[PDB]
Structures are given as C-alpha cells and as structure tokens.
mmCIF file of C-alpha atoms and ligand atoms in Angstrom:
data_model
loop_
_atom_site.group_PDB
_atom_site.id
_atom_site.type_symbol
_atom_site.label_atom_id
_atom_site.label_comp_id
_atom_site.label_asym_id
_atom_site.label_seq_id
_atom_site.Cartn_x
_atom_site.Cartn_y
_atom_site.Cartn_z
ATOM 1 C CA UNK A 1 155.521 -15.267 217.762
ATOM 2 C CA UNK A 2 154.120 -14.567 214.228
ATOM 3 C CA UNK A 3 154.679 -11.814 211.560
ATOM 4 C CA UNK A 4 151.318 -9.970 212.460
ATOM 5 C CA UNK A 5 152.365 -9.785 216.145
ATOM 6 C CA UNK A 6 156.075 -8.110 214.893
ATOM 7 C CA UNK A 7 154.189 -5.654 212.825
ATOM 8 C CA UNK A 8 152.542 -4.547 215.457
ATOM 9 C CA UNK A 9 155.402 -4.107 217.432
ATOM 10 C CA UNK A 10 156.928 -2.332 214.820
ATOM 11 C CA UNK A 11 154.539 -0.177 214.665
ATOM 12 C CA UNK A 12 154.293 0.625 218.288
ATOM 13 C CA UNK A 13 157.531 1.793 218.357
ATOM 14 C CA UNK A 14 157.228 3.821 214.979
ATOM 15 C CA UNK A 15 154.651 5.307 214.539
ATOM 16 C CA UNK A 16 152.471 7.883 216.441
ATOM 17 C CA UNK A 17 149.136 6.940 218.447
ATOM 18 C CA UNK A 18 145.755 8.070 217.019
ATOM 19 C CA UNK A 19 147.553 8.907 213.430
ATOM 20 C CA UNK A 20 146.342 6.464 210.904
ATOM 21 C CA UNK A 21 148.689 7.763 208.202
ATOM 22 C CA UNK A 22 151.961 7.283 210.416
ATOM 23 C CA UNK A 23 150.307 3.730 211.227
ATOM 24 C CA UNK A 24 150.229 3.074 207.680
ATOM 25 C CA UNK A 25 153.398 4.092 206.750
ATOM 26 C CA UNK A 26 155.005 2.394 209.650
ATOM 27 C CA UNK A 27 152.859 -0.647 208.168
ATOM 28 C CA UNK A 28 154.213 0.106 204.395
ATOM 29 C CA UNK A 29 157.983 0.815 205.716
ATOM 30 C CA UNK A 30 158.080 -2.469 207.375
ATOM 31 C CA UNK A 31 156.518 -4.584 205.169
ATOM 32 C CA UNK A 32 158.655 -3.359 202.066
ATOM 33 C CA UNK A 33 162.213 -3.292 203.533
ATOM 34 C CA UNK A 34 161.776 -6.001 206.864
ATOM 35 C CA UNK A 35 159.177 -8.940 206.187
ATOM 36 C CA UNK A 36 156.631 -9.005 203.245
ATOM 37 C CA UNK A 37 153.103 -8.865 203.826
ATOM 38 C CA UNK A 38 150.415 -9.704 200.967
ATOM 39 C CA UNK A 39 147.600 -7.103 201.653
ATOM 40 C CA UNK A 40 149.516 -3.736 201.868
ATOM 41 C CA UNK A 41 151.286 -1.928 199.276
ATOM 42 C CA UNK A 42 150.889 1.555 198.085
ATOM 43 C CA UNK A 43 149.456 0.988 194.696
ATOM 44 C CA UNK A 44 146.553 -1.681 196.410
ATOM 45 C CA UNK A 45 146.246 1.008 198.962
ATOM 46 C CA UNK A 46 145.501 4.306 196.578
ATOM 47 C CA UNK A 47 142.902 2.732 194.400
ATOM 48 C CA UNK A 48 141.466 1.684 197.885
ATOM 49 C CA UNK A 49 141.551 5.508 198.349
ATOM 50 C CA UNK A 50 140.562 6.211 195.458
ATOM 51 C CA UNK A 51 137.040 3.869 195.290
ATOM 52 C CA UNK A 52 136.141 4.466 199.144
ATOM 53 C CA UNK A 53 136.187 8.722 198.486
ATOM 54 C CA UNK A 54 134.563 8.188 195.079
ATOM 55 C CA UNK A 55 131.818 6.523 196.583
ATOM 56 C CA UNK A 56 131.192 7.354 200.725
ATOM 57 C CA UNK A 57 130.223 4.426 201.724
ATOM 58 C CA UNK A 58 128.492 4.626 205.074
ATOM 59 C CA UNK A 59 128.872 0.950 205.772
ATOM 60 C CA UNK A 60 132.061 -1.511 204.531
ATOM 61 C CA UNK A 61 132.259 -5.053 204.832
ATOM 62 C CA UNK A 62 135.591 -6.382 205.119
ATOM 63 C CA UNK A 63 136.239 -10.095 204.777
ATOM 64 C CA UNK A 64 139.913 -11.222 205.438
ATOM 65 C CA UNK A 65 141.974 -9.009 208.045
ATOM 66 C CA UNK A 66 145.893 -10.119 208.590
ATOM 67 C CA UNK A 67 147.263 -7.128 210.978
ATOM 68 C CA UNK A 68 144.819 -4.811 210.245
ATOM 69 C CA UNK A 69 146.336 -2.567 207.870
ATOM 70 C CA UNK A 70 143.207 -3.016 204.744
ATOM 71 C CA UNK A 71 140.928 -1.074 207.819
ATOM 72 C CA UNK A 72 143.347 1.542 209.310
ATOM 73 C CA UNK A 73 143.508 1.917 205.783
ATOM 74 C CA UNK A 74 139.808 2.126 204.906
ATOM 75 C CA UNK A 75 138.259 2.995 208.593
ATOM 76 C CA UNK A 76 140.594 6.485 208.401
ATOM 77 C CA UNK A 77 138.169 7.445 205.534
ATOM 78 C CA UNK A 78 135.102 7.181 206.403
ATOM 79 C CA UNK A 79 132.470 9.908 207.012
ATOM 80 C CA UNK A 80 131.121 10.205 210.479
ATOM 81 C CA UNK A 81 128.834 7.582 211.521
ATOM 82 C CA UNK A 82 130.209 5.474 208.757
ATOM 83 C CA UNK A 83 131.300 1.967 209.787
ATOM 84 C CA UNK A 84 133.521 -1.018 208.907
ATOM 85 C CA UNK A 85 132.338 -4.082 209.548
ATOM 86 C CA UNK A 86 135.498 -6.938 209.733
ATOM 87 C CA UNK A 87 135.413 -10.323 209.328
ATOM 88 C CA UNK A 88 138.219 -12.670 210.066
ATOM 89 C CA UNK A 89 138.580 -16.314 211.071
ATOM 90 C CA UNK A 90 141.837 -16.497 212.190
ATOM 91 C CA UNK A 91 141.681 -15.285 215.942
ATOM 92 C CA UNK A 92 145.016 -14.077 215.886
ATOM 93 C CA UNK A 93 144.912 -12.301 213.438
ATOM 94 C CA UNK A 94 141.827 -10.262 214.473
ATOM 95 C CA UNK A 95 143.044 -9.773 218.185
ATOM 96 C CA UNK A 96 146.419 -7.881 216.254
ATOM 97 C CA UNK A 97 143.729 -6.092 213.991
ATOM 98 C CA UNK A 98 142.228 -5.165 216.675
ATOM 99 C CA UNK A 99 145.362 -3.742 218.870
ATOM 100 C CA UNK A 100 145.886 -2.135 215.165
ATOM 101 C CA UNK A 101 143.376 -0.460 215.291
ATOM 102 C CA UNK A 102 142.842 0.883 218.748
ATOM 103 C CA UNK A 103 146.544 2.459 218.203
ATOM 104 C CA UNK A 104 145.139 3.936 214.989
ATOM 105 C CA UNK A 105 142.340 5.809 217.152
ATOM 106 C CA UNK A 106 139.685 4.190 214.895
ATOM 107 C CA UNK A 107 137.987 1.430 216.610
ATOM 108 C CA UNK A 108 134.882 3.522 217.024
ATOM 109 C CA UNK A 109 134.181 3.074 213.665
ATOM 110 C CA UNK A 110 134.749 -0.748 213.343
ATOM 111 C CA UNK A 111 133.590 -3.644 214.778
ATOM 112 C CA UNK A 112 135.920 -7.072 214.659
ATOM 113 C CA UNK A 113 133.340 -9.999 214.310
ATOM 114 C CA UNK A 114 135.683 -13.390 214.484
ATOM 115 C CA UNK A 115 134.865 -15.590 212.305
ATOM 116 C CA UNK A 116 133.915 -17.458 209.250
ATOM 117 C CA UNK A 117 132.380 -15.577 206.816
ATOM 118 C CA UNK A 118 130.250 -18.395 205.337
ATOM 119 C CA UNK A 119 128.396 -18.708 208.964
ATOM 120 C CA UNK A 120 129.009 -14.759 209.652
ATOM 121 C CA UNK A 121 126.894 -13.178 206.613
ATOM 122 C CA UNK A 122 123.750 -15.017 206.776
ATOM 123 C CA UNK A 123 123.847 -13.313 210.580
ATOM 124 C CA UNK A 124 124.315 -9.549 209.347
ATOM 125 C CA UNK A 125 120.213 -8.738 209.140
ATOM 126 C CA UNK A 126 119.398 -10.256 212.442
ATOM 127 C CA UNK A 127 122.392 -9.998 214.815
ATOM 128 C CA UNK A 128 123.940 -6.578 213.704
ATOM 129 C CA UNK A 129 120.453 -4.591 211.918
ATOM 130 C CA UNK A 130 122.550 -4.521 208.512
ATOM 131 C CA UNK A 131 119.922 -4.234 205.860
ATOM 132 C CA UNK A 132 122.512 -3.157 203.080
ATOM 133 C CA UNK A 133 125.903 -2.490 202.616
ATOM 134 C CA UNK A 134 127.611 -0.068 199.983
ATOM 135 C CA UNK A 135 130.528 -1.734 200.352
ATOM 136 C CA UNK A 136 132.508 -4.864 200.264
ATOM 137 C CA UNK A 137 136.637 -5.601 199.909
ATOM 138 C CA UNK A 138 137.200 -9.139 199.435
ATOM 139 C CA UNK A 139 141.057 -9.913 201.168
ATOM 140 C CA UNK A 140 140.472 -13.163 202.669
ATOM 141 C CA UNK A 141 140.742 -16.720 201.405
ATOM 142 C CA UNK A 142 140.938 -16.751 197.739
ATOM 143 C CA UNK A 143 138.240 -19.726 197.458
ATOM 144 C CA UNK A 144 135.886 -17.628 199.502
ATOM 145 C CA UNK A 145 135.377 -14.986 196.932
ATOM 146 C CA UNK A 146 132.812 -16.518 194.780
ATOM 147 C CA UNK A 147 130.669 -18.512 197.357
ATOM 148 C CA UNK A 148 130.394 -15.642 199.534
ATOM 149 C CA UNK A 149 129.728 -12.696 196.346
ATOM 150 C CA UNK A 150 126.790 -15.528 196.026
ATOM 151 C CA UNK A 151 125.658 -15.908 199.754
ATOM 152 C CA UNK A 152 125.881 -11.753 199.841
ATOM 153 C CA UNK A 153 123.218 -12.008 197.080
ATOM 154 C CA UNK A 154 121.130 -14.657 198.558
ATOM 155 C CA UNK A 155 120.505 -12.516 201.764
ATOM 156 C CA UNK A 156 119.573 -9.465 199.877
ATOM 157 C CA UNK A 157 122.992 -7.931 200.949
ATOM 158 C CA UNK A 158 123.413 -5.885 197.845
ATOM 159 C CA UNK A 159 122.428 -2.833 196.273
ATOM 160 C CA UNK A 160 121.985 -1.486 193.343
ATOM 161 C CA UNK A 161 125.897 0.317 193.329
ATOM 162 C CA UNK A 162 126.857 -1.397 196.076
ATOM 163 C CA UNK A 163 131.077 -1.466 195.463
ATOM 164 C CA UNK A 164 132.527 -5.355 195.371
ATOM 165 C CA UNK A 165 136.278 -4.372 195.628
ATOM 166 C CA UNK A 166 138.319 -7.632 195.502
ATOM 167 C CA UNK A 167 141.998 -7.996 196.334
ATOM 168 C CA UNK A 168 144.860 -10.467 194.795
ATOM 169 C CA UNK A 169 142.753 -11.157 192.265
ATOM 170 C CA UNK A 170 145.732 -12.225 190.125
ATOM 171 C CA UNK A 171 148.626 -13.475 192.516
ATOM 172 C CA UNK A 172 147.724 -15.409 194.334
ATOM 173 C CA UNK A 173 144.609 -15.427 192.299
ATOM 174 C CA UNK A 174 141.081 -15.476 192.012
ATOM 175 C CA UNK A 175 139.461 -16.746 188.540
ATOM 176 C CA UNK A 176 136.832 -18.053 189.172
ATOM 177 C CA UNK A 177 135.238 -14.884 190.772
ATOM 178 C CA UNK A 178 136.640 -13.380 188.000
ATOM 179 C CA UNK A 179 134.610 -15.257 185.282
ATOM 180 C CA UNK A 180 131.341 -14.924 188.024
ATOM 181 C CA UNK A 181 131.391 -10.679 188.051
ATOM 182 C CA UNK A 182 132.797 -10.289 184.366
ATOM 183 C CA UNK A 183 130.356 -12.989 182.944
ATOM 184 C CA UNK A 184 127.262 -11.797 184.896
ATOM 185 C CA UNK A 185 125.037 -8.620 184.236
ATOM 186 C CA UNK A 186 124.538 -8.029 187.518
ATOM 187 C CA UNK A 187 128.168 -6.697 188.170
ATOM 188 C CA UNK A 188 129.547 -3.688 185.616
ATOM 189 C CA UNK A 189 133.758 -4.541 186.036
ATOM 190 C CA UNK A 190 136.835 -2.157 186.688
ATOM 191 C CA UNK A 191 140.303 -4.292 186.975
ATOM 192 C CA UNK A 192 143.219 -2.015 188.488
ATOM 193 C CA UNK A 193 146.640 -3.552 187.507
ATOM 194 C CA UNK A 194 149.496 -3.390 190.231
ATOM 195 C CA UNK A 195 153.036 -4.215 189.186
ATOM 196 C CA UNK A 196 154.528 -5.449 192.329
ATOM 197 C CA UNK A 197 157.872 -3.866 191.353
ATOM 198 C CA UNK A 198 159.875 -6.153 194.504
ATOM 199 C CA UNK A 199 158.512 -9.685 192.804
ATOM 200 C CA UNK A 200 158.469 -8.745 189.393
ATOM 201 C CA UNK A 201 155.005 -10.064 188.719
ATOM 202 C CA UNK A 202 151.930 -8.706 187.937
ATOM 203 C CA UNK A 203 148.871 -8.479 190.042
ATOM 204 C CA UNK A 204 145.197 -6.599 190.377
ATOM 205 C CA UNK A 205 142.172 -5.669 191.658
ATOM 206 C CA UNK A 206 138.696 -5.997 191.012
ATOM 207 C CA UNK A 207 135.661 -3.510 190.726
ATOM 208 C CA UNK A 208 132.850 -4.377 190.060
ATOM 209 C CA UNK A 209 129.255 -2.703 191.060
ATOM 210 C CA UNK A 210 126.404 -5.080 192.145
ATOM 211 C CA UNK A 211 123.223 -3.580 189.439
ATOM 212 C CA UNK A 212 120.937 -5.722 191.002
ATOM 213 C CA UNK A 213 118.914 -8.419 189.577
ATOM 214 C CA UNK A 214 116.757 -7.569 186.103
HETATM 215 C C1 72N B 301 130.693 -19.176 188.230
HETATM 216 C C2 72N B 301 130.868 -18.749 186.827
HETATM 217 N N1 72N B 301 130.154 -17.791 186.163
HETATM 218 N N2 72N B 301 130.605 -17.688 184.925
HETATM 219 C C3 72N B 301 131.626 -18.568 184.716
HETATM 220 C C4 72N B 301 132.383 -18.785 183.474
HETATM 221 C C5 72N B 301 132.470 -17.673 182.453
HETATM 222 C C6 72N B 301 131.617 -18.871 182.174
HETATM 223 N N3 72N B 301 131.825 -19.289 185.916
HETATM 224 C C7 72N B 301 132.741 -20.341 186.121
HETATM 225 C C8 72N B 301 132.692 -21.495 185.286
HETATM 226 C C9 72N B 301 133.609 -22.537 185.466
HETATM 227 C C10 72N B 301 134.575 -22.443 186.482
HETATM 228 C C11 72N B 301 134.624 -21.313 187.320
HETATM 229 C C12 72N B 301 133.713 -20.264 187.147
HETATM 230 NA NA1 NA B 302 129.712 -8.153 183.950
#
C-alpha cells in the first residue's frame, strides 16, 4: 500500500465523479491535514492557473506525475481538443494517475505514456505526430530538469513562447536548471515564490519562455 494509492481512496470516497474541482480539493484537503504530498498546494496550483489561461496551450507536456493531481489540475483547463501529454516512470504512480484521472472525467484529454523521459522525448515526433508543444511543467526528478530542457531543444521541441513551467525549484531544489534558463538568452525568466506556511520554508517556481535560438 503506498500514499498515492490512499489518496486515491480518499478521494473516491470524497469527492464527486467527473468534477475536477471536488477532485482537487479532496486532493488539497487530504494532503494538508492527513499525509503530505510535494506537488499540490494551493499557491503551486493558482500560478498553474494562472500561466495555463494566460497562455491556451493546445498541447502540455508533463514530466513527473505522483497521483495525478498536477493534470486534474492542468487537463480541467484546457480548451477543446487541447491535450496533456504525461510522462512518468514510476508505474505506480501512473496507473493511480491514471484511475485519477478517469474519476476526474478528463482522460480524453490526456494520454499516460510510462516512462523515462530521457528515452520518451526523442519519441514525441515519430510515435505520437508532436511537432511542437506550447507547453511544458517540469515535476519529476529534480536532476532531470536540465538534461531534458536540453534534449527538448535538441529535437526541435520548442517554440518560440513555448511556456517551461518548472516545479520545486527551491525545496527540494533545482539550481542548476536555474543557472541554465536565467543564464541563457533563449529563455526570458518569471520565479513565483511559495511560502509553504506548514514547513516554514520557502519554495518556487519557474517561468521561463523558450525565444528560440538567435
Ligand atoms: C548549465 C549552465 N548554464 N549556465 C550555468 C551557470 C551560470 C553559469 N550552468 C551551470 C554551470 C555549473 C553548474 C551548473 C549549471
Ligand atoms: Na535568461
């Protein structure tokens, strides 16, 4: 038994099927008053909001999923026809995402691929017709960020505006991405602070907006 598999549970019993905001609370509830969970919280989730209605993106890639609650969160946004693409290694972990989302109602607009991003990106154009995507939230292993922001620009992934939108950029932390968007002139850079008010410690996200090469 593992915490994503009680989530789920939890929100089985508490929230209402095809309602991605009750699944979200439910997700939020538990995770703030039961057992903690890194990738939700409120203040992560309305700058998520916030960036995916500034910008419409008609197709996300999501790298990292833990019970699903990043795309309920982002897959309940999009326009019609829009889609979220997932990545995640762990196969737990995406079978729960998956259950997550079929409560949700949303798994129309997202499809689960399992596993390593590495080996799963240089696949996109060929396997799944992605030419680009306008897109990207970075949630998954922390020493992933970097070499796969680079791998996304060696297969011509990126737009000019495509959205990088990286998670736990502070705790547990991700500098050296950090120095790569900041430092380069290929990304323009928004950090978000979150004060996670339960651990007393600060912590952020990352914006920044792939200009392309020049
Ligand atoms: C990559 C990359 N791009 N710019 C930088 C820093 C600002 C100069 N780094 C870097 C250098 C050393 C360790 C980790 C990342
Ligand atoms: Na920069």
């Amino acid at each position: 038994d593992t915490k994503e598999q009680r989530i789920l549970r939890y929100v089985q019993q508490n929230a209402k099927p095809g309602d991605p905001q009750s699944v979200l609370e439910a997700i939020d509830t538990y995770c703030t008053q039961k057992e903690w969970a890194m990738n939700v919280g409120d203040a992560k989730g309305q700058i998520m909001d916030a960036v995916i209605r500034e910008y419409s993106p008609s197709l996300v890639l999501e790298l990292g999923a833990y019970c699903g609650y990043s795309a309920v969160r982002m897959a309940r946004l999009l326009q019609p026809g829009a889609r979220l693409l997932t990545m995640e290694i762990n196969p737990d972990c995406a079978a729960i995402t998956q259950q997550m989302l079929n409560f949700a109602g949303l798994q129309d607009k997202v499809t689960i691929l399992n596993g390593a991003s590495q080996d799963l990106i240089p696949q996109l154009k060929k396997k799944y017709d992605v030419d680009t995507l306008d897109m990207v939230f970075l949630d998954h292993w922390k020493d992933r960020y970097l070499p796969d922001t680079l791998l996304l620009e060696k297969c011509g992934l990126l737009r000019k505006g495509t959205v990088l939108l990286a998670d736990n950029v502070i705790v547990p932390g991700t500098p050296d991405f950090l120095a790569y968007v900041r430092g380069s002139s290929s990304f323009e850079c928004t950090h978000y602070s979150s004060y996670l008010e339960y651990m007393k410690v600060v912590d952020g996200l990352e914006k920044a907006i792939y200009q392309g090469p020049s």
